[PDB]
Every structure is written in structure tokens, then in C-alpha cells.
Amino acid sequence: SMSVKKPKRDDSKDLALCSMILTEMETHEDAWPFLLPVNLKLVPGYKKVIKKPMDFSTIREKLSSGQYPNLETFALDVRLVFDNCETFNEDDSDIGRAGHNMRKYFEKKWTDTFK
């Protein structure tokens, strides 16, 4: 409350560390469905169904231009990529499995870096 604060967690490395995680997600062999925005002209249904499209290249641009206020808003966009994937793709598809694999990969790096 006013003039009463928990001890200050060092967030000075968070930008660099999110960048490193994102590099590791970009270079994973199963990243290919997520590297670029889904083409809304060429994928029927996507525009209407997926209200907030997100992909690794958009996260990279937001990260590089100071559009994440804190490390949690960064994690919310990464998770949005996988939530969108599950919304649109069957679990038993190459893309559906890719999304599950990457969400696991992310969540481990996230816990190991920050928790």
C-alpha cells in the first residue's frame, strides 16, 4: 500500500532473457507454423474465428520496440500463439502437435529462467 512495499525483485535482465527464450523458440524445428502471421486472405475462417492473431515475428517486433511493459505481458502473447493454434487445429495434425510441443518447450524455459 502507500509507502509499504515488498522487496524489489531485479527485473533489469528481463528484456534480454525474454529475447533469449524467443530465439530458442524461433530456432526449434517445430516452430514453422508460428514464425509468421497466418495469411488472413488465404486461410478461410481464420479472420473471423481468431480474434487476436499472434506469431513469433510479431512478438519479436513488439519486444524490440518496447511494447511489452513487463515479462508477464510477454508470456501472455507467447501463450496466445498456442491457444490460437489449439482453437483452429485438430490435436491429431502436424500443426496441432507442433503447438503442444512448443507450449511445453516454452513453459519449461519460462519456469527455469524466472521461477
Side-chain angles (χ1 to χ4, degrees), residues 1-7 9-12 14-114:
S1 72
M2 196 180 333
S3 307
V4 180
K5 286 310 160 328
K6 290 203 187 51
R9 186 203 167 249
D10 184 12
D11 69 342
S12 61
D14 287 2
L15 188 59
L17 283 159
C18 289
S19 187
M20 284 173 63
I21 295 169
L22 181 58
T23 296
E24 295 166 355
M25 276 194 310
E26 294 167 334
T27 60
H28 193 293
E29 78 164 287
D30 299 340
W32 58 264
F34 312 114
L35 296 176
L36 299 177
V38 174
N39 181 339
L40 301 178
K41 302 174 200 292
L42 304 181
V43 180
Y46 210 87
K47 189 170 199 308
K48 186 63 179 275
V49 171
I50 301 291
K51 301 299 171 187
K52 290 176 65 162
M54 188 51 59
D55 68 282
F56 295 166
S57 82
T58 302
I59 296 170
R60 173 69 75 194
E61 187 62 37
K62 286 178 72 169
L63 194 60
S64 292
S65 61
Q67 291 186 66
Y68 292 118
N70 58 57
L71 84 166
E72 302 300 337
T73 61
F74 168 87
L76 282 169
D77 267 355
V78 174
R79 292 168 182 141
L80 175 62
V81 170
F82 309 126
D83 293 346
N84 289 345
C85 184
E86 276 198 55
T87 291
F88 210 80
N89 295 267
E90 274 293 350
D91 293 345
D92 188 9
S93 65
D94 293 276
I95 290 168
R97 283 185 282 281
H100 287 294
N101 286 352
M102 296 295 305
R103 181 192 304 270
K104 188 89 179 168
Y105 190 72
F106 171 67
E107 291 304 346
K108 169 100 151 69
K109 300 284 182 183
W110 191 251
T111 295
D112 293 357
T113 303
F114 296 118

